[PDB]
Design a protein around this ligand. Structure first.
Ligand code: CU
Length: 235
């Protein structure tokens, strides 16, 4: 149970974005139904009044929280991967539009899931803004909690993989468009009951065997991190 508070751009806090530049849902409950329209941008997908200005190559940091800013972030039980997707904003996230910029699942070197590292990072994970065409975009940050993922939601709706989905409105101003954005995958649709990484038993199946759900990270993606960029306590 977690939500995005706001973003940072090059380590500069853009301020509380809830219902402002984040298409915030009404609460931190997960999406679980893989065929739900709620898979696109969570349960209240609509245009919010602001879009955060960035340039290609900026570091864009998403900041998550549980109940209040810079708290426990997400229950420690919620082990799983983190991904970030991008889509042109005029799509409203509909159709074959979502391109993956970032994936972090289980780190064999550190013996830690992305969610574990997100807590350590005070809720912060980042991407490099890609060199796509200037314009308005949706950045879809997705945490998958796998602590009840041994079941399919379609077999037992009390369980299932949990999707914490947050869409940020980002305007890319300066970009040389060296990597034009291709078509991508649909949400809902990309993840099905048979997709690798959706049904996974963390109690019985070693995390070293986990394969995150496709799609693969796009060749145009420039990378990212799970690391604290900014200190909310100094504000
Ligand atoms: Cu939860």
């Amino acid at each position: 149970h977690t939500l995005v508070w706001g973003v940072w751009v090059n380590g500069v806090d853009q301020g509380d974005g809830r219902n402002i530049y984040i298409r915030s849902p009404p609460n931190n409950n997960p999406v679980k139904n893989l065929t739900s329209p709620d898979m696109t941008c969570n349960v209240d997908n609509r245009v919010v009044p602001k879009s955060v200005p960035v340039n290609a190559g900026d570091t864009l940091t998403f900041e998550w929280y549980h109940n209040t800013r810079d708290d426990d972030i997400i229950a420690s039980s919620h082990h799983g991967p983190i991904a970030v997707y991008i889509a042109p904003a005029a799509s409203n996230g509909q159709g074959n539009v979502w391109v993956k910029l970032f994936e972090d699942a289980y780190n064999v070197t550190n013996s830690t899931w992305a969610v574990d590292r997100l807590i350590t990072a005070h809720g912060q994970h980042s991407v490099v803004v890609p060199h796509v065409a200037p314009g308005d975009y949706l950045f879809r940050a997705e945490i998958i909690a796998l602590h009840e993922a041994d079941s399919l939601y379609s077999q037992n709706p009390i369980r299932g993989a949990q999707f914490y989905i947050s869409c940020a409105q980002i305007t890319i101003n300066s970009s040389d468009d060296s990597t034009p954005l291709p078509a991508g995958v649909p949400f809902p649709g990309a993840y099905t009951d048979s997709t690798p990484g959706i049904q996974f038993n963390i109690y019985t199946t070693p995390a070293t065997s986990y394969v995150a759900p496709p799609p693969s990270v796009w060749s145009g993606a420039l990378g990212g991190s799970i690391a604290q960029v900014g200190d909310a306590s100094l504000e």
